[PDB]
Design an enzyme around this catalytic site. Sequence first.
Site, PDB file in Angstrom:
ATOM      1  N   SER C  95      -2.216  -2.332   8.266  1.00 17.71           N
ATOM      2  CA  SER C  95      -3.442  -2.637   8.730  1.00 17.71           C
ATOM      3  C   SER C  95      -3.630  -3.952   9.205  1.00 17.71           C
ATOM      4  O   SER C  95      -3.036  -4.903   8.942  1.00 17.71           O
ATOM      5  CB  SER C  95      -4.252  -2.650   7.285  1.00 17.71           C
ATOM      6  OG  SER C  95      -3.839  -3.779   6.580  1.00 17.71           O
ATOM      7  N   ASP C 217      -9.454   7.550   0.381  1.00 17.01           N
ATOM      8  CA  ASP C 217      -9.105   5.859   0.185  1.00 17.01           C
ATOM      9  C   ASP C 217     -10.258   5.388  -0.295  1.00 17.01           C
ATOM     10  O   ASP C 217     -11.342   5.275   0.152  1.00 17.01           O
ATOM     11  CB  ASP C 217      -8.510   5.538   1.388  1.00 17.01           C
ATOM     12  CG  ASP C 217      -7.679   4.284   0.966  1.00 17.01           C
ATOM     13  OD1 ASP C 217      -7.581   3.892  -0.275  1.00 17.01           O
ATOM     14  OD2 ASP C 217      -7.172   3.355   1.816  1.00 17.01           O
ATOM     15  N   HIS C 246      -2.188  -0.236  -1.079  1.00 14.83           N
ATOM     16  CA  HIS C 246      -2.156  -1.053   0.291  1.00 14.83           C
ATOM     17  C   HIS C 246      -0.965  -0.690   0.854  1.00 14.83           C
ATOM     18  O   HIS C 246      -0.888  -0.764   2.145  1.00 14.83           O
ATOM     19  CB  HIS C 246      -2.358  -2.406  -0.457  1.00 14.83           C
ATOM     20  CG  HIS C 246      -2.718  -3.027   1.091  1.00 14.83           C
ATOM     21  ND1 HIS C 246      -3.717  -2.639   2.183  1.00 14.83           N
ATOM     22  CD2 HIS C 246      -2.153  -4.249   1.570  1.00 14.83           C
ATOM     23  CE1 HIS C 246      -3.550  -3.492   3.075  1.00 14.83           C
ATOM     24  NE2 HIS C 246      -2.775  -4.636   2.802  1.00 14.83           N
TER      25      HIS C 246
END
Lengths: 130, 641, 269, 338
Positions: C95, C217, C246
């Site tokens: 991310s 999610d 994560h």
Amino acid sequence: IVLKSSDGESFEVEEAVALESQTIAHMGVPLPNVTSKILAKVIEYCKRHVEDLKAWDADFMKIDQATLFELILAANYLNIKNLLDLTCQTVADMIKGKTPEEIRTTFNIKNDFTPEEEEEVRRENQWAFE
Amino acid sequence: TALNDLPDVILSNIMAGVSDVRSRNSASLVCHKWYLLERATRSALTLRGNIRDLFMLPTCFQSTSHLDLSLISPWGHPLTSAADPDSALIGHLLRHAFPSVTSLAIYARDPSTIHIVVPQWPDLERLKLVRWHQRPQTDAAGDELKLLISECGTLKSLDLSSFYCWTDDVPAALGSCPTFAANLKSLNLLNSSFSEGFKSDEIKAITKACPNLREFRASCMFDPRYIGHAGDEALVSISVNCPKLEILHLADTNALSSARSDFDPDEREGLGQEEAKINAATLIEVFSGLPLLEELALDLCNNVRDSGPALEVLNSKCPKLKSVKLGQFHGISLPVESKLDGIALCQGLESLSIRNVDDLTDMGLIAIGRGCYRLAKFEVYGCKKITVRGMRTMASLLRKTLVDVKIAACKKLGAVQSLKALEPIQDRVERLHIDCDWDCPDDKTWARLRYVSLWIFVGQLLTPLVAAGLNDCPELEEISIKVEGDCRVLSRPTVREFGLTTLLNYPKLSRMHLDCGDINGYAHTAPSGQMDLSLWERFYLIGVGHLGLTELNYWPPQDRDVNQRSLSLPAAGLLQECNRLRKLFIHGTAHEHFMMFFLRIEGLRDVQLRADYYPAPENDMSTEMRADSCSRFEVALNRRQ
Amino acid sequence: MSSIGLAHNVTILGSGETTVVLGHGYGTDQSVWKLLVPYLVDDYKVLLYDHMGAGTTNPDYFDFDRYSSLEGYSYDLIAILEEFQVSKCIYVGHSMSSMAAAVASIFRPDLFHKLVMISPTPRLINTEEYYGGFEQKVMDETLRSLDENFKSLSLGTAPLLLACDLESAAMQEYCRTLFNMRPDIACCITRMICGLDLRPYLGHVTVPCHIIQSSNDIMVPVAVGEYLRKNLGGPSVVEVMPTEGHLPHLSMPEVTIPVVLRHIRQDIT
Amino acid sequence: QTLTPEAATVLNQSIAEAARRNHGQTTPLHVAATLLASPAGFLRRACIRSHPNSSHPLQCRALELCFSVALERLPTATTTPGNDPPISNALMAALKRAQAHQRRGCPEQVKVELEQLIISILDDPSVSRVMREASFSSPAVKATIEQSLNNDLFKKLLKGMTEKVWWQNDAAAAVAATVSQCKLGNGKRRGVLSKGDVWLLFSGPDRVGKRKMVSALSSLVYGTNPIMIQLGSRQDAGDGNSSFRGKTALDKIAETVKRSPFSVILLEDIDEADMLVRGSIKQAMDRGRIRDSHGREISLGNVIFVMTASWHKLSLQCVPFAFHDMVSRVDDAVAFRA
């Protein structure tokens, strides 16, 4: 046996106490290198060794530095391994836990190290895990 | 008179007596004569530095005899590599800098390291190899061990208690040159990282190769379930092949582990709990074969029962016997009426360590105390029947000599119970270990107490330690705490801190071991609503700055799933607050950002990240430790003025 | 070797003409790909590195002015790729690092042959019409905590706030690794991420993108994948895996790794 | 008089340089500077070889420069130049060290040769200290010089499996034979030493029968349920264990073997397993220990392993070349009938 000090004083010595010292055992028997108080401080230790121990020994160590130096000199001259190594360990105890300046001060030591030399010795010492 | 007027010989004698290396370094700065004396007198050196600047090695240590190269930074780095041609020069550099080395401890990351460094000293007498990393692949078994055999070699003691390898490497190496094995007078193979202990055939071959062994420790496999497990034949081969043995230490690999869940039969899911192939007759023959035996340690994970007759034969056939360590030996003390039996007949014992004895009762303890009247150190582990009465009476019997007591995992003997039990010897005990168990149902000055070891389950507090009885310890100077457990199943603490500020009660405390490395938790990702390991590190380390610690060994908790023992942000932050720290060893990993927190500590000199656990991180890619980070931290630390 | 290779701990593994570049997320380092690297070294040239904010890099090299915007990270990535003679690389990113790679591709399309993204997002703070991140208030708490930790370290007191002290239980999982850095650098990176928004630039990305998300999610909404597919300027595919956390590429390797390997080896998108 | 003719020469030239400047004493810095001269000497070659940065020619002359300034830092002595200055204590130290290093290198048995001398005078703290500021480390060149110097059971289980999987009688008899003989010790051996682990490859298309087969074999020999690990495209709600967290298939296999060293392990679809898992299995079958994803080595014990294959006794013609090594190295291969 009866021994004679450097000053001329005489002390009575047991046969086993005499055999404690290799120098005395191998050799009136005058001792022209040691004084009266030296025997007065060493004879009780010799007798105790011939025949609680930790406390008594710590009490017997409770003497000034100069008297102690005379003692270790006497142990070397009389060549008594136990007395000499105990004495040298006792002095080396005040070596530990002190900075070099503290050693110099407690020992009237004169410093002949230049700052560059001190730095170099510190640099060498940095290679040892303390 | 002053000392410089003394003859120099007694100066060398007097100054060979300062063993404290900090004091030795201080003495080297007194004057030129004192410096020369110290450099000619220093015998033990543990090298401190980085591999990069190893050619800046001082040559002032020409007279050293024992040299320790396993702590060269970065920890575990290959000191010599076959990828760099100038790595051949490292052997010569070490040979010239320390020409008088007889005892050596080196980190053997690579075979080339051994082959280049070890044969440098033909007079080498004792060798210790360390390797917590992976075993490199070789053409056959023992190829890296074969490199120890030198033409002019006379190696006498070999230590592999931390050198991870395949158990097949030892017999292959020992069989390759009979002279090398015959010259051996000591052999330590008590490595807990072995996947499985030595086979029966491997023990037979090892002892056949080395008939002159005086001390022999091995990590053997005594589980009967496996094939070729060591049994009676292995022990009789030990007795026949090594009649000169003075120290014999056989323990199962699980018994050597740091975690109690690996060797405790109660904590294993049915493992163990089955007889070994060990009979009383076989033990009798073994003890008859070792007239010179002095130290015995049989720590098995499998039960041996009715061992009383064997222990009785021990007393007659081993007059020199001084120390006995028994693991899961049952029936060691079975008193009838009043006649002593079993281990109680070994009057010559000085230290006794027993573990997981089902038969033991209070009468067994009383018999041990009454028979072994010379006992100076007593360790008992995991006996469910003994109580405070028996242990207290055994202490009162041995009150004249008992100075070291360990009471762990005893179901009926809690922390308060253990401290009450040690009342008769309260003013004499020097080393002490208890379990901080507060849930056990059913004039006070520790004048000589100097070392306390604690074990406590994860999530419990340490505050009740003072109320437990360990209140006034004027001489207490080092305390070691081990925390074990699985915190993945445990909720958030309702109390904010573990309570290290409670340790301010003991004014002379200056050293610490905080072993949290056996806590299992979540490293960086908790599944959902769980608490990661940084929270527990904060809970345990808060207030560590208040203590006037000067040395600290820290074991960060681990995450077994992902295999990492990282130092968290709160851990580094709290350790930074310890201003008085002089040495700080962390048995884990920490990246550069957290490592640079420690430069705030002014008095700090020795810092190292030591991954002394199996398996150590193989390379920089697999962990958050980098070689450049280590070098930058060390340079910054040294430059600090 | 080179200064850029030493400042980023760059490692080259494997063989073969095709190069795979693994860009870790913020708060971790290249060690997070230790479970994926063995699957690639046989038939790929894997390039691992740490971006300048990571804890494994020198805190002194960190330039607060350059790295207060994502353009700094994209330029650093371009410099790393150009130094090691890497062209038509395959980028796998976590991310907000895949976002930097996407911007780099905008500047230098020739370097990137495809983009594989693990739970990406163009803008982290959701607006009224944009549900593509978290509410501003729930992240204000984490900013406050990071600021307080930095303040504590300035005075010489330990930083005593963690992501486990937030109340979202989703901010706890998202922001756990943000506290794995020096507090000032953590504050800088967090503020950059909060101010980051790439929504205007989504139309300039021409390299194919392979978005990978977690099933249902709680952290980053699954609808962001469809949003990016609609706004991306090049070919795009979205796959959803029944993973969680994560760092699925570390905590759940047996599920995440097959998905990533498949998206790496298939080009058709 | 205890030195070689060349060492005597270089010492007296050091002396002559000492007498030309009248700087009190003949410190070893002077003799080192003498070694810098006479370019046939080994110190130049040693210095250029030791440091890569030393390949530049004028850095060697910079060495002369840094020696020279230190010499210029020496106050002069009020004495006639026609005399030998007293060689300093460090020089007797260096000469004695040279003598000792010469003595030890040939323990079987003194005229000191040039290289021992130069090593000795690099050992001098002042020479090394001066060299350190000149980017030169005496230990490196010293090591370079020194290195250069070197120039029944069968049926008792057959009946049960024939009860369970009666459509696979021939394969059942073959596997009964192989399992009974390896258990009894009539099987493959890991070299000269015997091994306990058994490695079975189960080909054929009947999957459910093979699963009940291995269940029966487990429940008979070990009295335990089998372990459900899959590798191929056969995953279901039991193998997909997120509870394991950071474990791949290899990690799962290793953990299961570690925790249950006495059971049967069946691996589903070894043909569809990753090249990594197959390579790991090859390593386990050779070295007798399975390595997981973290490099830890776990002993196989004696666990019963069965790989459920699907290529079409097992014929070598029907085995792909990639799996040929597995078949050659497996303890036995059994083909299930269709």
